[PDB]
UniProtKB/TrEMBL annotation, chain A:
One of its GO terms (biological process) is larval feeding behavior. One of its GO terms (molecular function) is ribonucleoprotein complex binding. Residues 1-287 form the Origin recognition complex subunit 3 N-terminal domain. This is Origin recognition complex subunit 3. Transmembrane segments: none annotated. The gene is Orc3. Component of ORC, a complex composed of at least 6 subunits: ORC1, ORC2, ORC3, ORC4, ORC5 and ORC6. ORC is regulated in a cell-cycle dependent manner. It is sequentially assembled at the exit from anaphase of mitosis and disassembled as cells enter S phase. The keyword Phosphoprotein applies.
TrEMBL record, chain B:
It comes from the Eukaryota. Component of ORC, a complex composed of at least 6 subunits: ORC1, ORC2, ORC3, ORC4, ORC5 and ORC6. ORC is regulated in a cell-cycle dependent manner. It is sequentially assembled at the exit from anaphase of mitosis and disassembled as cells enter S phase. Interacts with DBF4. Interacts with POLQ. Belongs to the ORC4 family. Component of the origin recognition complex (ORC) that binds origins of replication. The gene is Orc4. The chain holds residues 358 to 456 of 459 of the full protein. It is found in: Nucleus. It comes from Drosophila melanogaster. This is Origin recognition complex subunit 4.
Length: 590, 90, 175, 239, 14
DNA sequence: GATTTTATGTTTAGATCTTTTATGCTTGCTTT
DNA sequence: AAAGCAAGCATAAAAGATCTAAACATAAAATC
């Protein structure tokens, strides 16, 4: 009878139990993911800092100062990524204490009266929050009397953020900009427009006169594909985190970013779901960390972790290529663990610096079929062995046709890039001296090959040494990876795609076409009552003459009318059809 | 509204009828869609055009004048270019 | 058949709790009724937590009853202010002061006939955006995500789960 | 009680009538008087140009009265046909004086050099300045096709813009997609985001959008959807 | 398969 | 005398009844 | 045979006209 039910227990005015939060895997996941989130946050702040300082300088320069100043900011098509950015802007204007600011979201502006009251109420309550008058009384005149009641012997600016400029109704927005133009000079106003599209929307939505009484200046935050390129080059492909994605999941995430939504936050949520689905298989998956704490967890492990290590498929070739106490008595495998984990982390560090050298080599070339960005060569390299691809063959063909002097200059720029990577990133990391110790003689070999090209056939020797010294050993395919890399890679696209990409259409259709795919019938691979009516109206055209359709249902299988009307009721609950409004006892497919 | 006898109009139909004159004018070649759209909205806000009560460029509209007012304002206007007068006699 | 998939759905429950721990919001999307399974979840691990059952397929369930229920029966702060946006502002600043005041809501049918307007789903999207509160929702209609734009879908931090019994719709047509 | 508007008083009457009033007209300026208005502020603009030393040595000797009058005739030869609105002529005339003065800071003999930029300055009258997902590109393309290529031409390809139901949009999207994507939640969310960003618009059916009876209306001209078909590389003029 | 690999490698390595 | 509280008269926004119009849709005649 | 225009039609939505439920500010009295 109630539309709502409560089961409240003990509330007045960390869901999980002790048995999981005690386990190391949640502590490791929280440490690694918090390092990830802090890194991508400071990266977004450093990319935003030019625009934010330009905005604060614009507000202070208008305080240095009737047509109102206003500063549009060309935000991306998605919303929540900008929101915290705007809040930081408010903190800056409460840092220097020259402006107070009320956000003016379009939900609050159904009419001009509502817009003016939320504007005045937000200004007075922002000022009270920096340090309860009636909703019916908060007019602009009270705002003027309150501003001269307070701020005159100092002139704090009156900021009104409009995060969703597109979502506003045009009439209330033009009336609001006209009212704020009427009161500028007496009240120092600035207006910022979060235009989700382009400048044509601002020039088109604002009418002749509203544009005549406005003074707008445009700032640009970075575009979303550029933001995914920066987040992917600088965090998920940064060496110092121990958890690498497989090329399938990597391609799927950049696919969802580039094909459906420009959601940087959606990319962060998908990567957090990948981190959770990998790490939550037990404590054994929490060996995937920095090497010394990994040795402490090597000592820490129990017996279930031994079984969830040993069944991993990539351990299987390692026993193929050869120990009795290793496979049963555990502790001998525990002592063999630093060799495998150390070679694996060594392989991924060598993979990252070798990938940097390769993308620096290929990216200066014209066409770049493999790609000019590190994630592209990353997914092409982890997807399959690169030497068997046609694309590497086209790359070595166009690379073998090069002029010798541009060749030696290009490889010299690649040498400067790889040495900058060797001195500036791998060096703080543990097991970093070992990797430069491994790759540095091969860098010396390509260095001497450079010096003899400085002195035709020689480029084939350079490509052979590139394949032998780098591409075969330290740019391997995911199947060719060193064993028990399964702790450090996440190849499982199936659960992530069925738990991130939702397909209500495909789920309903695969229920109504192949019930055995769900129901696990031993016979139906006996039919469910909905499925026959679904098969029958799928056979039917647009309009449904209901009695001929009903006679087909009588033919395939009184109470038959009850099962049929029950099926059409469940069908029209699903939205597949609707009953005709022009004509009773008749249907229409939707 | 003289040729089609007081039918409702729109910015794009009048844009076609204006761009038939713009490409032969040799004084109005330089104007774009934007200045003409601002002129159209300015004609809307002085209430020389009324909406029939969608895009800003695609409302239906009605003229608010008798033709004698337009025929008189062509005469009393100061320093009208002669090419627009030859369009006025057509 | 049906009992097997129902027990397999009960096997997922601790992992659902770990998913709920990280800010995700569970969202079923099956063909059959999600009623018996969600009630089994409400009994089998939610015997103690602050559960707000919401039958959104109710013909006359206003969003205002949900707002007043949250601001009254749990937080004991009286009636909500008349505007739902000021109401969720009050619920947000009320929840800002109180860590470890965890609570769950179980919404049968987000696609319900009174919730089908975009404003109720916007109120639900602002509702689940709080770090403290967590959400478990059912879905039946084939054309529900037409009203979820990317902003409301980002605030709805979902983790979809194909939970599909072949149950007849009995409560769904009872109201 | 003074009143002020642009409308003539005859718009103002109501069904009960109004009392007496004193009508009073203010004619907008002819070109000589607009030149007199813009030339009245010659002293302020000279004292502004003195603020920003060979260039100041030529500013003090050759920004005189008749030079500014010739500049005002050279400006009202161009913009006066497009607007007579005196604040906009002031606001653009000062910037065009700022770009006009360069080859008398160095060494008519000027109408070419400024008549270049002035015909770009006309293009930015009234405006006062000082990307898309791939499948959203195909959805905006299919929205323009559903809202321009009529209700009955589409059988053979496959008054203003015409309103259209969204199943027509998904059908044209399937026909133009040539890959056949699964109908994920993200794609219908992309529909609702083109709604929220004013790339599409509603006219009816808002209460039952999930019923499919809602009427939508694509709002884009030919040039940007051609830019979309260029950045995809897929031409849209074939349909 | 885990089982055939279990028989093969606990026959081989063990 | 001051505060609080609450009982009530006033306001305001939504709900609902006309009716207009109207337009997508039915379907049906007619036509190439 | 189907394609297109047409009599109408049947619900729909758009003012709009008018009233009712919720809110809300104010008056007034109970009490400290």
């Amino acid at each position: 009878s109630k539309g709502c039910f409560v089961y409240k227990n003990g509330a007045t005015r960390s869901l999980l139990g002790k048995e999981v939060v005690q386990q190391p895997f949640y502590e490791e996941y929280r440490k690694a993911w918090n390092q990830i989130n802090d890194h991508i946050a400071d990266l977004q702040h450093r990319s935003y800092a030019r625009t934010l300082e330009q905005l604060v300088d614009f507000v202070v320069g208008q305080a240095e100062r009737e047509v109102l100043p206003t500063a549009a900011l060309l935000t991306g098509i998605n919303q929540p990524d900008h929101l915290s950015q705007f809040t930081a802007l408010t903190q800056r204007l409460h840092a220097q204490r020259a402006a107070m600011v009320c956000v003016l979201q379009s939900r609050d502006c159904a009419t001009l009266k509502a817009a003016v009251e939320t504007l005045v109420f937000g200004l007075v309550e922002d000022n009270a929050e920096v340090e309860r008058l009636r909703r019916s009384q908060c007019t602009m005149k009270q705002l003027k009397s309150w501003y001269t009641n307070n701020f005159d012997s100092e002139r704090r600016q009156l900021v009104v953020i409009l995060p969703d400029f597109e979502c506003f109704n045009a009439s209330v927005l033009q009336d609001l900009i006209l009212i704020l133009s009427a009161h500028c000079g007496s009240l120092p106003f600035v207006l910022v427009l979060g235009v989700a599209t382009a400048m044509t929307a601002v020039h088109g939505t604002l009418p002749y006169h509203v544009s005549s009484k406005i003074r707008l200046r445009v700032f640009q935050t970075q575009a979303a594909p550029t933001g995914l390129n920066e987040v992917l080059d600088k965090v998920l492909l940064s060496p110092k985190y121990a958890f690498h994605l497989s090329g399938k999941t990597f391609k799927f995430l950049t696919h969802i970013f580039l094909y459906y939504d420009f959601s940087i936050h959606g990319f962060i949520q998908g990567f957090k779901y990948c981190l959770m689905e990998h790490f939550f298989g037990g404590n054994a998956f929490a060996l995937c960390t920095d090497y010394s704490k990994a040795l402490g967890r090597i000592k820490q492990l129990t017996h279930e972790d031994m079984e969830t290590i040993r069944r991993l498929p990539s351990f299987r070739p390692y026993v193929e290529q050869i120990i009795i106490a290793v496979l049963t008595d555990d502790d001998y495998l525990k002592k063999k663990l630093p060799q495998l984990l150390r070679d694996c982390l060594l392989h991924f560090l060598l993979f990252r610096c070798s990938l940097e050298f390769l993308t620096e080599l290929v990216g200066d070339l014209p066409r770049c079929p493999l790609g000019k960005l590190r994630r592209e060569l990353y997914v092409n390299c982890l997807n399959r062995a690169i030497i068997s691809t046609p694309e590497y063959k086209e790359c070595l063909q166009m690379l073998s046709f090069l002029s010798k002097d541009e060749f030696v200059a290009k490889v010299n720029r690649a040498l400067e890039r790889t040495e900058q990577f060797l001195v500036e990133e791998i060096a703080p990391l543990e097991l970093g001296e070992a990797c430069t110790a491994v790759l540095r003689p091969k860098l010396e070999a390509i260095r001497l090959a450079v010096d003899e090209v400085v002195k035709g056939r020689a480029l084939q020797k350079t490509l052979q040494l590139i394949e032998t010294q780098i591409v075969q050993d330290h740019l391997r395919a995911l199947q060719d990876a060193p064993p028990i890399h399964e702790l450090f890679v996440f190849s499982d696209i199936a659960t992530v795609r069925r738990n991130i990409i939702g397909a209500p259409r495909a789920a309903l259709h695969t229920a109504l076409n192949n019930p055995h795919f769900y129901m696990q019938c031993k016979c139906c691979e006996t039919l469910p009552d909905l499925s026959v009516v679904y098969k029958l109206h799928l056979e039917c055209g647009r309009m449904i003459n209901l009695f001929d359709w009903l006679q087909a249902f009588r033919s395939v299988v009184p109470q038959i009318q009850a099962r049929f009307t029950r099926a059409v009721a469940e069908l029209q609950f699903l939205g597949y059809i609707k009953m005709s409004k022009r004509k009773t006892d008749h249907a229409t497919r939707l | 509204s003289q040729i089609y006898d007081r039918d409702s109009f729109n910015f794009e139909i009048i844009y076609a009828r204006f761009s038939k004159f713009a490409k032969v004018s040799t004084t109005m070649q330089a104007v774009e869609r934007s200045i003409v759209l601002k002129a159209f909205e300015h004609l809307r806000i002085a209430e020389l055009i009324m909406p029939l009560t969608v895009q800003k460029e695609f409302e239906m509209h009605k003229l608010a004048l008798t033709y004698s007012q337009i025929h008189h304002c062509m005469q009393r206007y100061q320093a009208l270019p002669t090419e627009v007068a030859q369009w006025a006699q057509s | 058949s049906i009992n097997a998939i129902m027990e397999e759905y009960r096997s997922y429950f601790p992992k659902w709790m770990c998913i709920l721990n990280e800010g995700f919001n569970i969202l079923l999307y099956g063909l059959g009724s999600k009623h018996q399974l969600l009630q089994s979840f409400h009994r089998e691990v939610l015997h103690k937590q602050t559960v707000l059952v919401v039958n959104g397929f109710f013909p006359s369930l206003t969003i205002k009853d949900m707002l007043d229920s949250i601001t009254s029966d749990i937080l004991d702060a009286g009636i909500s202010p008349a505007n739902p946006h000021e109401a969720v502002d009050m619920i947000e600043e009320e929840f800002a002061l109180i860590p470890e005041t965890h609570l769950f809501l179980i919404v049968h049918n987000l696609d319900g006939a009174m919730l089908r307007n975009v404003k109720a789903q916007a109120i639900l999207s602002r509702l689940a955006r709080i770090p403290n509160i967590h959400l478990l929702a059912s879905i039946d209609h084939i054309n529900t995500p037409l009203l979820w734009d990317q902003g409301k879908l980002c605030s709805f931090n979902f983790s979809w789960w194909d939970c599909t019994t072949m149950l007849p719709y009995t409560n769904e047509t009872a109201f | 009680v003074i009143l002020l508007s642009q409308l003539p008083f005859e718009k103002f009457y109501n069904k009960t009538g109004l009392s007496e009033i004193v009508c009073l007209h203010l004619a907008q300026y002819n070109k000589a008087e607009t030149q007199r208005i813009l030339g009245s502020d010659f002293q302020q603009v000279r004292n502004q140009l003195l603020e920003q030393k060979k260039r100041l040595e030529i500013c003090q000797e050759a920004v005189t009265e008749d030079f500014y009058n010739n500049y005002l005739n050279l400006f009202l030869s161009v913009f006066y046909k497009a607007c007579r609105d005196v604040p906009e002529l002031q606001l653009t005339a000062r910037k065009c004086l700022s770009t006009y003065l360069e080859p008398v800071l160095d060494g008519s003999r000027l109408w070419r050099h400024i008549a270049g930029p002035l015909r770009s300055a006309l293009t930015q009258i009234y405006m006062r300045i000082e990307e898309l997902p791939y499948y959203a590109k195909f959805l905006l393309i299919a929205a323009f096709l559903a809202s321009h290529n009529a209700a009955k031409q589409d059988k053979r390809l496959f008054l203003g813009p015409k309103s259209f139901s969204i199943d027509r949009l998904l059908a044209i999207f399937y026909a133009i997609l040539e890959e056949k994507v699964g109908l994920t939640c993200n794609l219908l969310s992309q529909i609702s985001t083109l709604v929220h960003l004013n790339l599409l618009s509603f006219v009816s059916g808002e209460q039952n959008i999930m019923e499919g009876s809602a009427r939508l209306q694509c709002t884009i001209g030919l040039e940007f959807v051609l830019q979309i078909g260029k950045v995809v590389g897929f031409n849209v003029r074939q349909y | 398969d885990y089982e055939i690999w279990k028989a093969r490698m606990l026959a081989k390595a063990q």
